[PDB]
Ligand SMILES: Nc1ncnc2c1ncn2[C@@H]1O[C@H](COP(=O)(O)CP(=O)(O)OP(=O)(O)O)[C@@H](O)[C@H]1O
């Protein structure tokens with residue numbers, strides 16, 4: 034039988050976009066195509082507001098937009114736990130929490146874009162022990178992104194190389210590089226972002242005057 | 246006052262995708278940013294089935310998918326006229342028809358991707374007299390596409406160069422090259438295309454067993 | 458033993474660029490990795506001047522630039538035959554001519570980008586009989602390009618899908634979308650195109666006042 | 670009269686590629702088109718070997734390749750100072766050193782791709798004081814890259830948006846996303862990278878057995 038799997042996506046989702054959502058679908062199909070996995074659930078976990086960030090909309094709104102975006106999904110849900118904590122928590126800790134939650138046990142994997150993988154190389158950004166635990170105890174499902182070479186990042190990292198069987202590279206012959214940064218600026222300029230992010234999310238942004 | 250404008254998009258829409266729809270939004274914002282136009286409507290006109298094509302799903306289905314995709318749009322509608330004709334009609338004729346329909350009169354412009362513009366250079370593809378009438382009597386709103394240089398196509402074409410004031414180049418700093426061809430193959434392989442095309446279109450394709 | 462292969466690329470090469478050149482290298486590495494072939498030579502064949510077209514520099518200029526571009530190549534060369542003919546010639550006929558030369562035996566395959574492959578669908582652009590001869594008698598090596606889905610073009614063409622064993626899809630993991638149209642416009646504006654096309658081609662362009 | 674400018678690019682240049690080089694040309698053409706400047710020289714400054722990093726070839730090798738790459742450049746040169754220092758140095762400090770050299774006056778601006786600009790947000794990666802000195806004392810010229818929205822990074826950074834007059838966004842109309850990570854992996858697999866990086870750099874790599 035196929036190993037059951039839960040995909041966990043950490044990040045800003047400021048706001049959640051069609052590409053963030055597309056990421057989950059590509060990862061699930063890739064894992065199923067291997068013939069040894071069955072993805073049973075996806076989790077969108079918005080980052081805590083304390084994460085010293087450019088400036089994110091309040092997490093209350095980011096969780097809301099994700100919930101609304103996921104209404105038409107029968108397997109992906111938002112989980113506010115991470116954003117409800119008194120403060121920012123390292124990713125490996127969110128994985129531990131959601132793993133405990135799950136506790137015949139499905140494997141919990143971190144779903145991210147290849148760019149995140151490139152950041153593992155940034156000095157002080159990630160603790161080597163976290164990089165190791167993330168790839169060894171949980172797993173990584175990385176979706177391709179233009180300009181990044183996931184296979185090379187893996188080969189050049191002693192830690193990732195050693196646990197590469199637990200890293201799954203997925204990529205669809207599509208080219209969709211819509212950045213939430215662009216989305217925010219377009220919204221701020223009164224321009225349309227329709228068809229770049231869900232209609233339900235555009236409605237919420239309009240109703241609550243976000244990204245002005 | 247701003248000149249009123251109707252955007253007409255001709256093509257396969259086999260099936261209509263988020264990018265086809267995105268094209269309309271980018272064009273409208275570009276025309277409004279000029280300060281001299283007010284886009285009052287968009288028309289999606291699926292190509293007749295007789296158009297000797299690879300093989301398109303029946304036009305009945307393509308019109309349906311467009312209608313469903315456009316349910317959440319308050320300014321874009323599908324018009325089956327072109328596909329209901331006994332046979333394929335040159336684009337300039339569809340423009341004339343929709344122009345007559347409109348008949349204090351708004352300008353009707355052909356909305357297309359920069360790749361279509363590149364095809365004007367293909368021998369026998371378009372009649373020079375049609376290329377001229379299309380750009381002179383109606384107008385062109387072209388949305389950028391990776392790999393194409395619209396400005397160069399215009400400069401190297403005596404006809405387009407002469408009527409370049411009637412060609413409007415729009416492009417959003419986004420990279421979305423999802424091809425309907427890829428969509429069809431993904432569907433045929435049982436893979437997800439969710440978030441690449443509208444949920445309402447995926448539902449119809451599933452219910453009617455299309456693209457198998 | 459490996460099947461000896463010769464790759465032929467037809468196109469305007471107006472001017473030849475680094476992507477044109479990259480195409481040969483990618484196609485060769487791909488054929489070699491199959492293990493069934495051994496590419497022994499590449500041939501750049503500039504189209505004839507009568508090819509009812511845009512802003513096409515005189516053929517001898519395009520042959521000379523390709524030649525300068527190829528000086529650092531140990532296996533690729535430009536063959537002026539096609540451009541030196543009196544009139545334009547369908548591509549199958551260029552494939553027959555070079556097939557003849559090969560006999561004063563290596564397999565002669567047509568090398569092109571995915572965009573060319575999509576043109577096989579354009580009404581009346583190619584004779585079905587020619588598309589068949591190309592992939593049945595000779596062979597087709599296609600390099601990926603952004604926005605194109607080669608596998609889908611092949612599956613949807615009743616002619617191509619029957620000859621899949623002779624069609625090789627070479628994947629381009631590097632986003633390298635340089636447009637010659639862009640190259641020409643930039644030059645005409647006095648902007649740099651260095652590192653986009655060969656240094657010697659740039660010098661030649663300048664010395665002969667091309668693309669102004 | 671025009672303000673004399675010197676462009677400084679810091680990075681690993683491991684190895685230097687055609688996109689790295691293209692970056693200088695694009696930035697120069699952009700500064701010149703403003704009319705307020707006249708770029709008099711470009712400087713490639715390879716990072717020091719102690720830069721806690723990946724698979725970094727010895728600095729003298731990276732300086733030599735950059736030098737071979739720059740032989741056909743009449744205005745760009747590599748300066749080994751940074752790599753020849755004893756330890757790694759924050760970029761502002763490299764900007765001060767070269768600012769000093771300039772005085773044995775030209776404006777010294779930091780040249781980088783949009784992706785670098787997005788890293789100014791990464792927690793603790795850059796000192797706010799340094800980001801300020803960079804765009805207040807010196808200046809920043811940024812070349813566009815796929816998936817990045819520079820205008821948005823600038824607007825959302827309270828530091829950057831205050832110094833917009835010293836930040837220049839150079840647009841790259843050519844999709845040229847070459848990854849050095851990819852270059853290295855391809856080489857290690859014995860695949861060609863010709864036309865992606867300079868011929869002489871390839872020769873040097875081979876002669877010194879780099880990236881195997
Ligand atoms: N277009 C895309 N394709 C593939 N993955 C993407 C993607 N856009 C975002 N992602 C991934 O989605 C996850 C969350 O992204 P975010 O934290 O929202 C940064 P972003 O989406 O780039 O917006 P930004 O502009 O605020 O940085 C990350 O793993 C990121 O790699």
Ligand SMILES: Nc1ncnc2c1ncn2[C@@H]1O[C@H](COP(=O)(O)CP(=O)(O)OP(=O)(O)O)[C@@H](O)[C@H]1O
Nearest residue numbers: 256257258259264357358361421422423424425426
């Ligand atoms: N991703 C994209 N970005 C901008 N324009 C696009 C686009 N995809 C399609 N278009 C435009 O939408 C119009 C209709 O396209 P279609 O006739 O459906 C061809 P297509 O969308 O490329 O699907 P295909 O794979 O069947 O060729 C054309 O003007 C085309 O240029």
Ligand SMILES: Nc1ncnc2c1ncn2[C@@H]1O[C@H](COP(=O)(O)CP(=O)(O)OP(=O)(O)O)[C@@H](O)[C@H]1O
Nearest residue numbers: 467468469470471476569570573633634635637638
């Ligand atoms: N950037 C690129 N990547 C992959 N293939 C490319 C390419 N640019 C051109 N080609 C391929 O090179 C061959 C000849 O191309 P050309 O006839 O010169 C069209 P082009 O290079 O786009 O110039 P154009 O814009 O003047 O038409 C074709 O097979 C084409 O697909």
Ligand SMILES: Nc1ncnc2c1ncn2[C@@H]1O[C@H](COP(=O)(O)CP(=O)(O)OP(=O)(O)O)[C@@H](O)[C@H]1O
Nearest residue numbers: 679680681682683688781782785845846847849850
């Ligand atoms: N393809 C590209 N287009 C535009 N800028 C690029 C580029 N590739 C690299 N650069 C720029 O060149 C400078 C130095 O880059 P490097 O430090 O070598 C990272 P890289 O080139 O991506 O190699 P890497 O994959 O080993 O990290 C940076 O400003 C970077 O943005």
Ligand SMILES: NC(=O)c1ccc[n+]([C@@H]2O[C@H](COP(=O)(O)O)[C@@H](O)[C@H]2O)c1
Nearest residue numbers: 043044045080123124125158159160791
């Ligand atoms: N060391 C860590 O655990 C670590 C470091 C950087 C980013 N992250 C996470 O990655 C996601 C995206 O972060 P960025 O916005 O910095 O790219 C967030 O959920 C963030 O918490 C975790």
Ligand SMILES: NC(=O)c1ccc[n+]([C@@H]2O[C@H](COP(=O)(O)O)[C@@H](O)[C@H]2O)c1
Nearest residue numbers: 255256257292335336337370371372579
């Ligand atoms: N000469 C003409 O009027 C002409 C030529 C080619 C395509 N078209 C139109 O462009 C749209 C897309 O055509 P393709 O599927 O061939 O790219 C269709 O609506 C088609 O009718 C019109």
Ligand SMILES: NC(=O)c1ccc[n+]([C@@H]2O[C@H](COP(=O)(O)O)[C@@H](O)[C@H]2O)c1
Nearest residue numbers: 467468469504547548549582583584587
């Ligand atoms: N019917 C045919 O054999 C046919 C049709 C179109 C293009 N071609 C060739 O393929 C290349 C296409 O170049 P363009 O797309 O710039 O016209 C040229 O070499 C051209 O000669 C051949």
Ligand SMILES: NC(=O)c1ccc[n+]([C@@H]2O[C@H](COP(=O)(O)O)[C@@H](O)[C@H]2O)c1
Nearest residue numbers: 679680681716759760761794795796799
């Ligand atoms: N805080 C700083 O001054 C700082 C931080 C990160 C990178 N850098 C520099 O910018 C370039 C970045 O290279 P990488 O992204 O490969 O680390 C290097 O030259 C590096 O030295 C400087």
